Paper text:
Ca2+-ATPases transport calcium out of the cell or into internal stores and maintain a low concentration of free cytoplasmic calcium that can be four orders of magnitude below surroundings. Ca2+-ATPases encompass the P2A and P2B subtypes of the P-type family, consisting of typically ten membrane-spanning helical segments, M1-10, connected to three cytosolic domains: the nucleotide binding (N), the phosphorylation (P) with a catalytic aspartic acid residue conserved in all P-type ATPases, and the actuator (A) domain, which is involved in dephosphorylation and contains an essential TGES-motif containing loop. P-type ATPases perform their active transport with energy from ATP hydrolysis via autoformation and breakdown of a phosphoenzyme and with structural transitions alternating between inward- and outward-oriented states.
Further visual inspection reveals closed ion pathways, and density consistent with a single calcium ion bound and occluded at a binding site between M4 and M6, equivalent of SERCA site II. However, the map for the [Ca]E2P form of G4-LMCA1 reveals no density for the Glu292 side chain oriented towards the calcium ion. Phosphorylation of the catalytic aspartic acid residue in the P domain (Asp334 in LMCA1) is clearly visible, and the phosphorylation site is rotated away from the nucleotide-binding site of the N domain. Visual inspection of the cryo-EM density map indicates no density for bound nucleotide at the N domain despite a 1 mM background of ATP/ADP in the cryo-EM sample.
Residue numbers in the entry: 1 to 880
Amino acid sequence: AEIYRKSAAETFTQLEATEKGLTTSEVTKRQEKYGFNELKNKKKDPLWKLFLETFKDPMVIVLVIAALVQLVLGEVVESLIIFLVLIVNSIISVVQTRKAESSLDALREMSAPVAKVIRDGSKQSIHARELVPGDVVILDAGDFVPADGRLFESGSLKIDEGMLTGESEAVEKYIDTIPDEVGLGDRVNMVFSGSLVVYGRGMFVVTGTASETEIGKIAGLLETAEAKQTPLQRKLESFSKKLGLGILALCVLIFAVEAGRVLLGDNSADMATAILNAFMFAVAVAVAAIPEALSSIVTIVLAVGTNKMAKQHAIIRKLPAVETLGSTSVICTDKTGTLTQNKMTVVDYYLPDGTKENFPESPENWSEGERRLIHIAVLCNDSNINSEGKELGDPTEVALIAFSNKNNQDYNEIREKFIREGEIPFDSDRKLMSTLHTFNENKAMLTKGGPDVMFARCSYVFLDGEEKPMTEEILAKLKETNEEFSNQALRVLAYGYKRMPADTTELKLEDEQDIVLVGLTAMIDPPREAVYASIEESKKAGIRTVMITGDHKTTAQAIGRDIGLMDADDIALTGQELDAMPEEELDKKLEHIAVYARVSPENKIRIVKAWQKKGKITAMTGDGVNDAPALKQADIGVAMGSGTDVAKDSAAMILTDDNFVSIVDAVGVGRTVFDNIKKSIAYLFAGNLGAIIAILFALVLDWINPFTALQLLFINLVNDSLPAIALGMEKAEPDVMKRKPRDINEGIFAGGTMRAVISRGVLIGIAVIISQYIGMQISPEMSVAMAFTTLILARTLQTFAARSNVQTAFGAGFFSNKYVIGAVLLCFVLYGITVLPGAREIFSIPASFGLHEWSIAAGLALAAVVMMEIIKVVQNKFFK
Ligand SMILES: [Ca+2]
Ligand SMILES: [Mg+2]
């Protein structure tokens, strides 16, 4: 910016320096007033018990204190079960919040940038945190540029600038003083901090050592510190406490028979302490109706979803948001590095004949000119693939070796067969590089370069025999094949094989005369193969996708056509067009275009804001600083595993393997988490209402109260904590995909839940009431005890089809979930122990043998379940 307009000498006039040396007379002083290089002193678990952290949501811990004031004066009377159920619920929550695995990789991402620099006229390797403005620092293909600056020494230099602004192909570097560019960085020819150099030699004056750097300026947009809530943070419990509190208001009128409420004589003049019993039954009813475990359910169902992503090399942070990827509808992407592999690979070879479209593997089934094209493509390289595959050197030569890997013929054998006989390394001004080798013991000249440069020098072409191209019908074919490749946006390279006569001396600068052309190699950064299926899965899932990248438009059109995103009927859209019209018309054209090219990091904010503004939950995936603002403005951010540490820290999802199908897997676990969180609470809410109507029906006819305070705590202990948690582990529901993303305008009150729990609660109420009326034969220990066991049996047995709203409890239901089987078994045996313990016998004193009517009561409980079963048939029938 601007620095480019002035020369390399005028730029340092403002910034005190001599471009060389910079003794400590200023370095030891002005660096402090200038500030330090690093921005990392910005933005960067206690777990003493961490159960207090869970003790901050609306609780019953204050309510349970009132239990002691009534439980005192009796050694066996005291009931601490309500106190101890909640602490156990927190214990499982905190241990499942730990997940036996922390948000690791926190120690993995270490920058530790080092720069080889000249201080006080001496050669050293000073830490990048100590670079001073105006400093003279050399560059090589073993590190990256540590600070923004202006180049002084220029030759055979290009850098991988695409990490911060998004050109897949590297940009060349040379000294220039063109003032009339924009300043994005695609042509400024200025070193931008953090960018990896390709190869060559670099030596530049360090202009900016501060947050003023372009990478630091990107963090200036990150500096806004945008903190928001989670889309599921809306709390229906706030309405539930209103309903629960209202029941308590009616509950003090439930015990209207008391002398203080009956307004009648014939009873004790004093109100007879039954208020405490009424108050005891009131809070016990209230704590039964209160979905206390619902808050604990949220943590457990989310933690396992994060744990499942940990086995897919998709470790994530910010646990409370994993269903967001399940609820998204539009996905923002980022061409460079995010879809492409950030590794240039040759995908199409063309020869003037070019008979074969796929390069044959075994050389025995090759073509005639294919050998020469490979030989020049393996010998005219400056890279090397070591025993691990380090790909040291320029990426284009790595693609040539990658081509040599396709045929299984390693480049090392040919490089060993003909080591070298002298060569002219590539220089920026003359885009050519020629290497001399031996063919059938005869010295041969091999030169490679740009397409049009060779088309000016393609004085011969050989595929079966060397001959003049007559500058027509073959040179035109080179023009049309170069043109279509440019239409495909491929950095096509042309290769030539010249017959050096007999003994060859050193190759002079002008030896590429009468160079016989071999063929053309077309290379382009290809998208990862994982994104092919990831789109067909997303396309059928009703999740729209848009690609945004600051690369050139021609590349943006080529990709997407290979992915299916491009409409193939309209031109792509560029960032400058957004400014041409108001943002409301941008919303109009937002849905009729899916590719955006040449967009600033701020241009990503406006589009991602518009997607959020239209009510669709958006997600941003990318690598590099050119994506950090969009990640935060998106309520869910996905950082590529190979991106800059700025991107990984800013976003909320990391894919260490750099896989892309994990996003679909993260979508699926997010959808299942929402269904589990929408069904686990549906089960407890439905059964809790069944208890309410049981009390309510006894009110209208003033039946004996059908429940006892000690058992309300017990049913809650066994049908509000364990079964709810187990249902949160519900198997992968049938076709969790193929469903359009859940509408964010609808809460848990959607038809799928309310139109089911309402019927579910009524069926419970009918069952328990029948038990009371059947139990009306004897009021004590028969009318009140018989109803308790039916509710416990009915409540814990209807979980069979509360496991899934699609799969039948028996037709498609099995012991698929060991958690629900264990929870069902544990609550069953625990109740079975406590019905015939021989020590307590809340049931009638005759227990475990006077079961002749316990069968019908148990059968009555199953009758509701089988009547609940036909509701499943109703779900699967046409009557819906
Ligand atoms: Ca409860
Ligand atoms: Mg990128």
